[PDB]
Amino acid sequence: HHQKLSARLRALRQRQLDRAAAAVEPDVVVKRQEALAAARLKMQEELNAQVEKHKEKLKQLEEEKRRQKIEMWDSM
């Protein structure tokens, strides 16, 4: 029966359309923004973790450089 085929497509269509319209419902908008803000923050803390690890490395390395110069006078 054809009306059973049509009804099925009709129902799928409203569903799809409603899914498409859902992206710009206010609640969806906010959750999308919350999601993106959350991923951002995750990354910001990780960038910052790295920044500080590298800065620490710098100071270690700068001290290793001081050691070497000092070592140089104190063998002389």
Residue numbers in the entry: 47 to 122
The authors write:
Mammalian p97 (also called valosin-containing protein or VCP, cdc48 in yeast, and Ter94 in Drosophila) is a highly conserved AAA (ATPases associated with various cellular activities) protein with a homo-hexameric ring structure; each p97 subunit is composed of two AAA ATPase domains (D1 and D2) preceded by an N-terminal domain (N domain). VIMP, together with Derlins, is thought to contribute to the association of the p97-Ufd1-Npl4 complex with the ER membrane, forming an ER membrane-associated module in ERAD.
We therefore used the fragment of VIMP encompassing the minimal p97-interacting motif (residues 49−122, VIMPx) to investigate the structural basis of its interaction with p97. First, we obtained crystals of VIMPx alone, which diffracted X-rays at synchrotron to about 2 Å resolution. The structure of VIMPx consists of two long α-helices (H1 and H2) with an elbow bend at residues V70-P72 forming an elbow angle of 132.9º. The minimal p97-interacting fragment (residues 69−108) we identified is located in helix H2, immediately following the bend between the two helices, overlapping with the P-VIM (residues 78−88). Although the elbow angle (142.7°) between helices H1 and H2 in the complex (D chain in the ND1p97L198W-VIMPx) is not very different from those (132.9° and 142.2°) found in the VIMP-alone structures, the directions of the H1 helix (defined by the swing angle) in these structures are different, further supporting the notion that there is an intrinsic flexibility built into the H1-H2 joint.
